[PDB]
Design goal:
Helix content of chain A: 25-40%
Pfam family, one (chains B, D): His_Phos_1
Largest interface: A-D, 24 and 24 residues
Order of helices and strands of chain A: EHEHEHHEHEEH
Structural class of chain A: alpha/beta
Strand order of the largest sheet of chain A: 3-2-4-1-5-6
Catalytic activity (chains B, D): (2R)-2-phosphoglycerate = (2R)-3-phosphoglycerate
Number of strands of chain A: 6
Subcellular location (chains B, D): Cytoplasm; Mitochondrion outer membrane; Mitochondrion intermembrane space
CATH superfamily of chain A: Phosphoglycerate mutase-like
Largest sheet of chain A: 6 strands, mixed
CATH topology of chain A: Rossmann fold
Number of helices of chain A: 6
Bound molecules: benzene hexacarboxylic acid
Organism (chains B, D): Saccharomyces cerevisiae (strain ATCC 204508 / S288c) (Baker's yeast)
Number of domains of chain A: 1
Strand content of chain A: 5-15%
CATH architecture of chain A: 3-Layer(aba) Sandwich
Oligomer: homotetramer
CATH class of chain A: Alpha Beta
Family (chains B, D): Belongs to the phosphoglycerate mutase family. BPG-dependent PGAM subfamily.
Chain lengths: 235, 234, 235, 234
Amino acid sequence: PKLVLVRHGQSEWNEKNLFTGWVDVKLSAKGQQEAARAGELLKEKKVYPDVLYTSKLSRAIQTANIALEKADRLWIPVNRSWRLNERHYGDLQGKDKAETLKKFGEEKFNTYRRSFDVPPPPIDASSPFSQKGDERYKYVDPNVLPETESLALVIDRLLPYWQDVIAKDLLSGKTVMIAAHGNSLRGLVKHLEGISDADIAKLNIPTGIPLVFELDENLKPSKPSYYLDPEAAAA
Amino acid sequence: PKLVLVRHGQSEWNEKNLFTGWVDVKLSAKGQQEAARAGELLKEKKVYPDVLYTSKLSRAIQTANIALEKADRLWIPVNRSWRLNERHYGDLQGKDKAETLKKFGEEKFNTYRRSFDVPPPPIDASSPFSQKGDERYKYVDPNVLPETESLALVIDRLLPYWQDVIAKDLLSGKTVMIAAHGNSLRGLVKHLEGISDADIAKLNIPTGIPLVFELDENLKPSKPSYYLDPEAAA
Amino acid sequence: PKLVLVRHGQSEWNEKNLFTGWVDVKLSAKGQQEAARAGELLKEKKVYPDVLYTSKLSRAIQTANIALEKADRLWIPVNRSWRLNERHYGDLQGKDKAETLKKFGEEKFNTYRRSFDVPPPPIDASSPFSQKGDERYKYVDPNVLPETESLALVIDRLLPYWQDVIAKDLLSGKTVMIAAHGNSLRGLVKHLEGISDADIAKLNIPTGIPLVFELDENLKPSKPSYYLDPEAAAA
Amino acid sequence: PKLVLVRHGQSEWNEKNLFTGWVDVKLSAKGQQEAARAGELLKEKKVYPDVLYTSKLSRAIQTANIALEKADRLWIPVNRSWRLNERHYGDLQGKDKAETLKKFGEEKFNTYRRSFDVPPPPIDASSPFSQKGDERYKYVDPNVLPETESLALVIDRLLPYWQDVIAKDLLSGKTVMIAAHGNSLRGLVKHLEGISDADIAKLNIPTGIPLVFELDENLKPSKPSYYLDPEAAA
Ligand SMILES: O=C(O)c1c(C(=O)O)c(C(=O)O)c(C(=O)O)c(C(=O)O)c1C(=O)O
């Protein structure tokens, strides 16, 4: 099989330097362009998505939309899941990134940003950056919705959708496109490449450049992953 | 139950004077401005789509993606079916509307455009504007795929989707938005409103404006449809 | 592609000599056995269903359940649909066929029973043998549901499910088993082979014997349909 | 949200003294009798499932098929998953329970049968009792398909299907009937009522008796669960 991952580009809150996580923030004007370049890179580099999987965060959805518009496969099937969602930022959701570096001091800030398993404190159900009871998460077990998270966790929850849902399509021969977020794609790629806990910290999945994994029946790489634009992914 | 219909705005061929039908033509910059204006009226008028049904045509899918972006409901689930497609135009696909008028005359021209039962002529199997074999219709019975169509025919193939798929949702208390084409929606409004086989021709659906139908437990209008902007609709 | 068709054995009404149509009548002792016979024949001639389709009438559901148990293939995906139902018998629903022969006369009995396009009168909504408002049809447009039908009418509604739903599986390489009823299965074989309206009345499809169809890209049959027991079939 | 749980009865193997686990052993005469009694009990107590969930093991699919044939709800939708399956018994599958005891001993046997987190040894794919590669699991990530299991692990693979799939229907408003096994249902019940890591062994789920739950908006019990036969249960 063939799989193509795509991280949205800059978002409205990303240029204001605010932590996003699950707040359904829009895709910046720049993020719509990096979207189109991914589309164009799909068309150009001849990767052809038979089905699409996004998260339930609009910045991700808007990316696939614009990208598929440019590759002319706007008509392919569409599934969404909270399991493809970005990591939840807890208390840190909607807090100024730089204003938070000063309150926590470089070490606590960084463990929260790039550690595999330490989550920011949970958010209040009353917060304005809380999704407790959001309409797009109304048919999911209220008990499983996080109020914070870490890479570790994000993966504990993404895996089951990958195992059952996104895998039928792959083993069905189909070519799957996933348009999700930064933490969730690094999380998928870790499961995929076998990277250690210690190691996943060093992986950057460059925004707007689709990454193609050609997999075998056991859903493990055939050959090593290729970005559709090398020098761009490496620069 | 609440239903919302959205006719996609202009396309690249609406500018060129070319009969489109099923050719997968794109929204023009103007079409996009229209799609957006529709999503805004959904937002502003507090009409909240729980689910989405488009056609397999991009210009329709583009309209959905733009409109629900301005409505912030870009997350609602979405299903697609060739049965929401616009009327297949047969031979007349990939051709000039003005040249077609200089050829067949006013009468045969109107007939190809607005007759209920009279379909344009069948398109040659191996033509540059035929969708026979399109990747997007590869899991449908090959024999049911139209070489041409008439509003009559269009409705014969739309009704079943409405009856089993769109209704499952409407009857689950969901608000369904449909984004399709002029004739497929012409088709469905006829069915919903009991409009005559003679009177359907005179109905047009303003592009970029959401027709909201407030249906009862028998999927029949409990009161007349209202566009979320009836003045720009006059 | 390959399609298996299974007509069910007698119901508890085909036994007391009654018209059933849409009455959710239970399969009879003689017919549950024909269901089992059906099962061993799928296993015997190595015909392997990867997905099952039935209708909403309990006599057809029961037949496949009892049959895939014998084929050792219980586990497969299952789809049920009113469109695969048996022809709605209208006013004849729940009436002794012999009393019905004298209540009408041979010509009007032959019509109501074997014509292609003249449906029996409609059954009143109040009548105890009406399915109007019955729960299993609650998510279907109230107006499409028949009050009486003809073989023609049955093909009209059968076809859309076959064209959109069944074809998708077939065209994806799956061997589809359909367990339903007489007219609906005949309505379907009329399509598959271009049988004329004039001749359709002649076609029988025995109960408890699987009609397999080897199809091609065009879902038109590749070679003559065959029963996995041509004797008890041609007998 | 109303949920109904149905454990299946004695399989062919529960009489021959062998560990079954993931082996698709068919139900026997009494197994097929108790299922019909579960069905009669449902009709009687007026519990009408709106949709069905079963594992991918014949014994429980049969129970549902027999139980719902007896309830008159033969027609309700049917969904299936390997996550609803019975606990994998790894290298104890296909083996006799008494001879197992002669190899491991009281302690190590009581542990492989009743510890919450110690799985029996794994089984080599080569064995005629390993489901690795079985057709019914060809559309699930191969890597996740257990070659042994513990109740802890059963809950871990199960929860996500409950969370996303079972709950959608329960939250949609429907009455859900699950028909799985001892482990998966006890594993579910542990979660539903908060039964502790070291207290769950004591919980018996009678076979053939339907267990009903009445859940609130949080899919947490609204009242204490109840069997449609409080006599045959204890
Ligand atoms: O999509 C078309 O080409 C079309 C249009 C159009 O220009 O959007 C119109 C129109 O004038 O609005 C009509 C019409 O007569 O209302 C038709 C019509 O013939 O159905 C079409 C068309 O070609 O289907």
